[PDB]
Symmetry: D2
Subunit: 238 residues, 4 copies
């Protein structure tokens, strides 16, 4: 049978491009969404028109709460139910906004910027591992600018740092199960002009290309690695 | 007057050593504690006998919850209430225990490991900054964050997040003259419940002396970062690890 | 026409697997070698049997000296002479041996370890850029550069310098459309001289499979970085280490 | 009785401030210089006025060559001949200039890689072979991962010095020799540089919109060689005002 992948936040932008490329490579896909139901179904419709019953949607709020563990279990379960297997988890969903240190409640901001960006990936990783010839792997969507962060983005940056720690800890702990764990770290008119490879427009498809590599048989010895896909931006001094 | 410092988890071990060395340097100190009330009061008693009215205690749970922002605000408020100023914040308190991927509910583990290690330092940083000389924050990091112990993912995530806070807060608070740095132990004071044979296994890994860091050695790096000799240093994390992090598998 | 690639130290082991995979992908190849003439010519013959006029050899010593720039210029020139273009440079050649701090002279060890691992890649990069589609350079780095082998200081210095070159050249060559990236093996093909018991010692450290990387697995990451699927990737170093660099002492 | 230190490139700027602070802390000092003889001698004379027979100068070119190992051995030897001991080595001397990809190139290699990396390696070898609170401090660069355009050889040399710091920390730890680094961002700016250009760099620094003084860099060196750092080895302390944290 065809392998199957879960992509979180898959309705639009980067998650959509990732789901499309996995599907094109022969994966069946779970398109996770929170609010973007119309877009998720529209994508599933397009993929199913290409190959019948190869795409399903799954609703879950990835905010941290007492029910986040159940929601993450359901995302993984939905893959097994539709397809009988779950070979690939892509932790792509993320919240992004500033949280200034000097002036949503702050604990709501914690729930979104830490919950969605780090805790949901952790819980999804647990559920994925617990439910397990094969080529099993997880890819976490990191941030190339994690060590040169945007001003007043402390909670966002903390969450993306935690995600690096998860990538490394899970790579170590899941290696005995043959589960590889890796990351892809994107960068980004003012910003475009900073990018060394700025002649090329940045695209969601370029991010997806790195995800496709990492889940492929061409990356079977790669675990705990984070691939920057940033056009050189992180190399540029102030 | 004398400057004042908040040290979290200061009743015992590394936090106590930091509080003691800050006090010896001339600081008035808030000794934060959670469960170790007898030890915290005993320490404050010793310090106050040395110089009267220079130490207070402050109890707070630093587990994440909807009241954590108020608890962190209160810790900073206690320093201003006792001493009329708050010059230094040391984020030392930490929960440390395994959370295998394959007692406590997972959401409790998240609240404790991510709350103590990262969210509380964030909220304390917010409160410290908002309440405002040589002002600085020192975060107790971990030199082994990139070579983590097996089955400690939540602990490791929290310490990674603490590196992110150190860097983000250094950037953002620099215009206010608040420096933000870290001290990253490798192996220092081993868990009390750890057997000696297991302690020795870890000691033997350390290139510089085949021994763990003393609490004083960790405190020495904190003292440097808060001192005038570190006035241009912000966003730096000083490993105090005897070379441990350089040793391959 | 078909694009062309220079692979240094391509007669044997990882460089050979890289040359083969680039050839299989459609590249014409310059097989650079130093001492392994029989192996280099044998490889070129095998590749030419597959597609005529798609492989040549080029001999050069990559030890540092006042003639190293001419040797590196010649390697790039050989690709233009054979194929009329040079699209890819893979800096794979390496000297590897201990140089303790406490029968070669020290300046020979410097010339060999720093020359082959760092200076030659720099000069080859200069020549490649000056002679100039999907142009790129791939440097063979080392996943263990921050947890080095005992008594390998010069080797480790050379590999650190190669990280610096990768980043500096990525920055400087980006406006010419030349990407510069690295592939960092952990334990891959072990030294020929090594005993089986010692080889197994190292194999057992690797989390993913308890085995070293095959040459083919290292080559796979090089193939990705030179491909159209990596056109926004520059200044990146991909570890291909089975998790080895994540394992504490 | 009093410990002794070698400081390379100690005649001016950062190395001068390091030599002064070490001397103030109680060290006897070898002031290494290459071209700056008058400044080296003036510093030695000032230090000897403070305490007799506590400073000497030592001339050497630290460019890579067949004679570099002997030169580096002689620098370390000069400390033992003057003071009977050598407790601290500070690798401060540096060549710094652009080397665009697109002086001969091999001269540039010899200068940039020799001063910044090979000379520190050879001095480390000689220091260790000759051997309490022993340590080495290497002057690194906080911007090694966000380098200036067209500075590849300089950047390669400073990356190699990070590798040396870590490899030597590991290998010399059994001998009780600690090996650490101090990594400035922008400190003392080139003397010729216009104030208007200096200001473009100063404005980038989060902490105070100014460059580090030489004394602030020296303060981190003094901490690292002190009894307060006796468990610290293989560590590189940035002294950069937050500069390395600032995105493009
Ligand atoms: N020890 C090492 O080898 C080592 C290695 C790497 C990093 N570090 C870091 O260095 C710092 C000091 O280490 P340590 O071994 O001295 O720390 P520790 O003894 O493990 O913990 C210090 C204090 O943290 C407080 N704490 C724990 N959970 C809390 C909660 N939910 N709310 C409020 N306070 C809480 C406790 O206070 P009460 O006792 O009052 O309840 C405890 O005494 C920590 O940040 C640690 O992560 C230590
Ligand atoms: N193997 C591993 O486990 C491992 C681990 C980390 C990094 N790496 C890196 O990956 C790359 C390939 O590894 P490998 O084990 O296949 O390499 P290797 O066999 O050690 O060396 C590859 C080739 O480099 C050439 N070479 C050595 N000294 C030279 C000189 N002075 N001038 C010109 N060429 C010279 C040799 O060519 P001739 O035979 O023609 O003389 C040799 O065949 C290297 O850069 C290595 O540092 C490998
Ligand atoms: N200044 C900064 O902003 C900055 C930033 C990042 C890193 N750093 C690092 O911090 C350290 C001190 O910086 P600095 O600006 O004070 O250094 P500097 O003035 O550029 O150089 C220090 C000394 O190095 C010596 N030197 C240069 N080439 C030499 C050679 N071939 N042989 C022997 N000695 C040689 C020179 O000695 P003579 O004058 O006697 O010839 C010079 O006075 C350096 O390692 C530098 O790379 C500085
Ligand atoms: O990080 C710790 C740690 O690695 C270790 C550690 C424990 C056993 C063996 C090696 C260790 O580094 O102990 C800790 C104890 C604490 O109270 C708090 C901590 O953060 C640590
Ligand atoms: O870096 C290498 C290495 O660590 C090792 C290595 C050797 C023994 C045990 C573990 C290792 O990673 O082998 C190499 C062999 C080479 O020909 C070239 C190299 O760069 C290495
Ligand atoms: O690294 C340096 C540097 O970045 C700079 C620098 C120069 C201009 C603008 C910004 C800088 O960081 O100056 C140096 C001067 C030296 O004498 C030696 C150095 O290593 C530097």
């Amino acid at each position: 049978e065809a392998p199957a992948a879960v992509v979180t936040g898959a309705a639009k932008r980067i998650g959509r491009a990732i789901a499309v490329k996995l599907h094109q490579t022969g994966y069946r896909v779970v398109i996770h969404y929170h609010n973007s139901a119309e877009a998720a179904v529209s994508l599933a419709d397009e993929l199913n028109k290409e190959r019948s019953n190869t795409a399903v949607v799954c609703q879950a709020d990835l905010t941290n709460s007492n029910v986040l563990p159940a929601s993450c279990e359901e995302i993984i379960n939905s893959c097994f139910r539709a397809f009988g297997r779950c070979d690939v988890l892509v932790n792509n969903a993320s919240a992004f906004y500033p949280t200034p240190l000097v002036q949503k409640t702050v604990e709501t901001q914690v729930a979104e910027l830490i919950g969605t960006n780090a805790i949901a990936p952790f819980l999804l990783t647990m559920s994925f591992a617990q439910r397990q010839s094969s080529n099993l792997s997880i890819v976490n969507l990191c941030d190339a600018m994690v060590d040169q962060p945007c001003m007043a983005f402390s909670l966002y940056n903390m969450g993306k740092h935690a995600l690096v720690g998860l990538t490394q800890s899970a790579a170590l702990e899941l290696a005995p199960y043959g589960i590889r764990v890796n990351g892809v770290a994107p960068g980004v008119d003012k910003w475009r002009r900073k990018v060394p490879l700025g002649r090329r427009e940045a695209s969601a498809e370029q991010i997806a290309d790195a995800v496709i590599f990492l889940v492929s048989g061409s990356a079977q010895y790669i675990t705990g690695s984070i691939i920057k896909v940033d056009g050189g931006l992180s190399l540029v001094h102030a």
